Amino acid sequence: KEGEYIKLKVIGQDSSEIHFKVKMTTHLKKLKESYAQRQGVPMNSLRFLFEGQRIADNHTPKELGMEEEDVIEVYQE
């Protein structure tokens, strides 16, 4: 019904963007870890939202109904 992979756009507090190519079944903790590493901040200092809802570590794009080029927002925790 859908592809195996998805591109997600992560928008940070300063409006900058990093895009991620993610398998639909990957736990989104992996995206949180990579994003925090690129920003040089502790992962625990950030919260990641999709459609205004907190993304859990074990949430996957498939579970959340994410689609190509959907936005994840990053706010300070």
Binding site: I18, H19, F20, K21, V22, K23, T26, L31, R38
Partner: peptide, 8 residues
Amino acid sequence: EERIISLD
């Protein structure tokens, strides 16, 4: 610059 990261 566009930034695309491949996640495993």
